[PDB]
Ligand binder design. Structure first.
Ligand SMILES: OCCOc1ccccc1-c1ccc(F)c(F)c1F
Length: 217
């Protein structure tokens, strides 16, 4: 595998989004993963509607809108629904709304998704290299997370109990520290223009490889 990957370089990552006071990280993680696949398949980079997932991938999928959800079940909704609308057509409001999905605004489909084996950072590396960005959960509870600015994030108090959905868009090494390149959804003010480099091959640090998944068109 390549020693480093950055899907931003391949034009497969949309602008960082801002979830506000709505726990829609899972929806941003899911659409991020699918956006990459849509670029790979069609050559067009298009932001997909996190709001569509918040409003429409609801109780049947075990999701709770602004109070949390699962990336995998979001993928299944997109499969079941035979599409997801673009962000432009179905914009993000940081609140729970009625389902307003319309196929005339469909910007992507999903045929399947894959869940990677628990805690296997080597398998995650392979997927990020060979498949695309991968949806993951991380333990983002610790005060240091919110205050991250640079370098490679390592928090001794981190656990594998994940609480925040994010997107792995790459990996590498910076000054001798291996990292996962993670796109967050707290706007470009967070971290490095909305990204955080998180420790890689350090014992499934912060649970980053606990629950990875990626969709396919
Ligand atoms: O904005 C993200 C907050 O997410 C919440 C909120 C409430 C209950 C659960 C979760 C939650 C936990 C883990 C994870 F990987 C998720 F993607 C995820 F949504």
């Amino acid at each position: 595998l390549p020693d480093s990957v950055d899907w931003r370089e391949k034009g497969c990552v949309t602008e960082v989004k801002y979830q506000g006071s709505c726990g829609a990280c899972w929806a941003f993680s899911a659409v991020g993963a699918l956006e990459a696949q849509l670029k790979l398949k069609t050559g067009k980079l298009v932001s997909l509607s996190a709001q569509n997932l918040v409003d429409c991938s609801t109780e049947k999928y075990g999701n709770k809108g602004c109070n949390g959800g699962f990336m995998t079940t979001a993928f299944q909704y997109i499969i079941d629904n035979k599409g997801i609308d673009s962000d432009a057509s179905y914009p993000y409001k940081a609140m729970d709304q009625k389902c307003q999905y319309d196929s005339k605004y469909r910007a992507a489909t999903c045929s399947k998704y894959t869940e990677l084996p628990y805690g296997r950072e080597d398998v995650l590396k392979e997927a990020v290299a060979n498949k695309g960005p991968v949806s993951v959960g991380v333990d983002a509870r610790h005060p240091s997370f919110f205050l991250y600015r640079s370098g490679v994030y390592y928090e001794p108090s981190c656990t594998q109990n994940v609480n925040h959905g994010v997107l792995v868009v790459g990996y590498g090494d910076l000054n001798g520290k291996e990292y996962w390149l993670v796109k967050n959804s707290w706007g470009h003010n967070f971290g490095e223009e909305g990204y955080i480099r998180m420790a890689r091959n350090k014992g499934n640090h912060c649970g980053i490889a606990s629950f990875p998944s990626y969709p396919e068109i």
